[PDB]
Amino acid sequence: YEQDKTYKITVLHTNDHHGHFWRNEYGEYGLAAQKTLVDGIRKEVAAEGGSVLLLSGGDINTGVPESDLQDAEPDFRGMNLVGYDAMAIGNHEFDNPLTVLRQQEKWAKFPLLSANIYQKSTGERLFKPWALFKRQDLKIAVIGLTTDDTAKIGNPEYFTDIEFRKPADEAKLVIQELQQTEKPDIIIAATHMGHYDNGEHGSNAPGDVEMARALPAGSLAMIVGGHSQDPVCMAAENKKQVDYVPGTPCKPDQQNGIWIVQAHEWGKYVGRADFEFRNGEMKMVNYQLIPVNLKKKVTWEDGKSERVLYTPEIAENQQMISLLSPFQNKGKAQLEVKIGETNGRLEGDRDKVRFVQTNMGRLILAAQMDRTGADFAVMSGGGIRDSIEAGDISYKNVLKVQPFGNVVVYADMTGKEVIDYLTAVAQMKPDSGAYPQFANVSFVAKDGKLNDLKIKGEPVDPAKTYRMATLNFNATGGDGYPRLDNKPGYVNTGFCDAEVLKAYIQKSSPLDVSVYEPKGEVSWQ
């Protein structure tokens, strides 16, 4: 670079896109509006003599039925048009076989990076560790890192000869390699690890904060995050804002001279970090999260509702609409499949699933027990994302109930472990995502103790073995649930939640909702 010259570099970033190539039903986000917003920033920055780098934190896959059944092709092709420069591989990039991810690398005109994923038998990386970019006369290196929880979280069949090494140890080696060979002026890490307040990861694998602390001071200009699905806006030192408002200022986190940013999810925001480079120094001038046609739900006293833009409308780029429309129609044609029927509504509403036992909880858990041969089951009410109306059931309806690509697991445990496990789970309160939905369990919860506890209408025998079904999420500590993944009787089946529910509905159709009707088997006080 030129000695003493001040350079302008804008880093644009998104993460956890999760199939949101199209605007939602309220006209929010979508890649068409993202394209207009990004095009306008490129033009403004170019007129100032600056540079733009557009990065993704990964998890493009899974989350919208139209996208899922097309293996995120519209998302990857849309990202080429927005003009993404690099992407970190996320854990949801492993929801599909490795061959599908290879085809996503063919569709993407930008590299999909991960330095820490290795073939066990050969000791070779499966992906490119980093990519290099020339911006003005500056050399910028982008490193990709994936959470080492991936194999633990996903389908085990996909990881037999694959290992996810500790991303922080891998980042140290990659930084040192780059400093010794390519000598970039700027190093950025695009990651899919998550942001945890003060590095308090809990049951999750260590994330961004912990990694930034372990690295040499300021060795990375920034960590472009993802995974945790949070707008990284600090309320105080080592504390992110709870319930961040779109359009408000966003103070990103800084740990050991390294900025840590995240742009929430679903293309809702484009994060913008404006930096100035001079003589090796990188200084952040401004940081913002730009809403992408986000709308506030406004409810009048007469009960009438409307959705209103927080900021002025971003027009949808027509070239993006022409690219995406055929995939939106193809996605719909693929979703036009009747998988079964129900004689009644299956209650999946938030104000029900997080408060009381519902027939949708019983249906999902019946599907999970049937696939695993389980005696009983439990799941977080927060894992039930929609209802199924009376009548015909489409694959789309099933995907809306279970949209996250969770995996079905089971654990064989003693009656004593069953007693201890259900006692801790019964402590989860209503009005929370952690509120438990049970199947084949009955008790009267009183003073943190379970009375008349039964499995399949029978008292729990401590010596007896019982199989419980749940999701990978809960089994690994999700929502503060007791860990099952470290128990000897644990088995991760690899089966997706939506596929298990779909197939069970198919073979049990027509559903008689009376069979799934909760009758106060579990109660508190």
Ligand X SMILES: CC1(C)C=C(CSS(C)(=O)=O)C(C)(C)N1O
Q: Does residue 350 carry a catalytic annotation?
A: yes
User: Within 13 A of 89's CA, how many CA atoms are on the CB side?
Assistant: 28
Active site residue 229: yes
265 binds, among ligand X, Zn ion, none (CB under 5 to 8 A by kind): none
- Complex with ligand X: residue 97 or 216, whichever CB lies closer: 97
According to the binding rule CB under 5 A, does residue 230 interact with Zn ion?
no
Q: Which of 34, 61, 91, 96 is catalytic?
A: 91
Catalytic residue among 125, 213, 345, 350: 350
* C-alpha to C-alpha distance for 338 and 129, rounded to whole angstroms: 43
**Does the active-site annotation cover 95?**
yes
Determine if residue 452 is labeled as part of a ligand binding site: no
Partner touching 498 among Zn ion, ligand X, none, CB below 5 to 8 Å by kind: ligand X
- Spot the catalytic one: 13, 17, 18, 467: 18
442 is a contact residue toward Zn ion (CB under 5 A)? no
Tell me, rounded to whole angstroms, the distance of Cα 446 from its chain centroid.
36
Catalytic, 70? Answer no
* Angle at the Cα of 229 from the Cα atoms of 328 and 255, rounded to 5 degrees: 140
Q: Which does 499 bind (CB under 5 to 8 A by kind): ligand X, Zn ion, none?
A: ligand X
Structural element, H or E, at residue 213: helix 208-214
Token readout for 396 is: 């789309």
Q: Annotated catalytic, 92?
A: yes
Least distance in Å: CB of 371 to ligand X? 12
Task: Give min distance, CB of 153 to Zn ion, in A.
Answer: 8
Partners of 523 in the beta sheet? 444
Q: In this chain, which of 13, 16, 224, 358 binds Zn ion, going by CB under 5 A?
A: 16
Please, which residue, 91 or 440, has the CB nearer to Zn ion?
A: 91
Residue 91 touching Zn ion (CB under 5 A): yes
Q: Is 477 annotated as a binding residue?
A: yes
Residue 441 bridge partners (DSSP): 455
Query: Is 352 annotated in some ligand binding site?
Result: yes
- Residue 391: count of CB within 10 angstroms of its CB: 14
Out of Zn ion, ligand X, none, what residue 95 binds, judged by CB under 5 to 8 A for its kind, is ligand X
Q: Is 192 a catalytic residue?
A: yes
Encode 178-189: b = buried (16+ Cβ within 10 Å), e = exposed: beeeeebbbbbb
Question: Are the C-beta atoms of residues 19 and 67 closer than 8 Å to each other?
Answer: yes
Work out whether 255 is an interface residue with Zn ion (CB under 5 A): no
Amino acid (one-letter) located at 202 = G
Residues with Cβ < 8 Å from 240, sequence gap 6 or more?
Answer: 195, 197, 230, 232, 233, 234, 253
Q: Which does 405 bind (CB under 5 to 8 A by kind): ligand X, Zn ion, none?
A: ligand X
Q: Least distance in Å: CB of 63 to Zn ion?
A: 8
Q: What is the DSSP letter of 340?
A: E
Please check if 473 is assigned to a binding site.
Answer: yes
Which residues would be at the binding site for ligand X (CB under 6 A)?
62, 68, 95-96, 405, 496-499
Distance CA 440, CA 458 (A): 10
Quote the CA–CA distance of 292 and 274 in Å, as a whole number. 19
Give the nearest distance from C-beta 69 to ligand X in angstroms. Answer: 6
- Which of Zn ion, ligand X, none has residue 91 at its interface (CB below 5 to 8 Å by kind)? Zn ion
Is 256 labelled a binding residue? no
Closer by beta carbon to ligand X, 271 or else 405: 405
Strand partners, 254: 259
Rounded Cα gap, residues 75 and 20, in angstroms: 7
Note if 201 is an active site residue: no
From the list 148, 178, 180, the residue with the least C-alpha distance to 164 is: 148
Residue number closest to Zn ion, CB atom: 227
User: Looking at this protein, which amino acid is placed at residue 402?
Assistant: Q
Please give the positions annotated as active site.
16, 18, 59, 91-92, 95, 192, 227, 229, 350, 354, 385
Q: By the criterion CB under 5 A, which residues form the site for Zn ion?
A: 16, 59, 91, 227
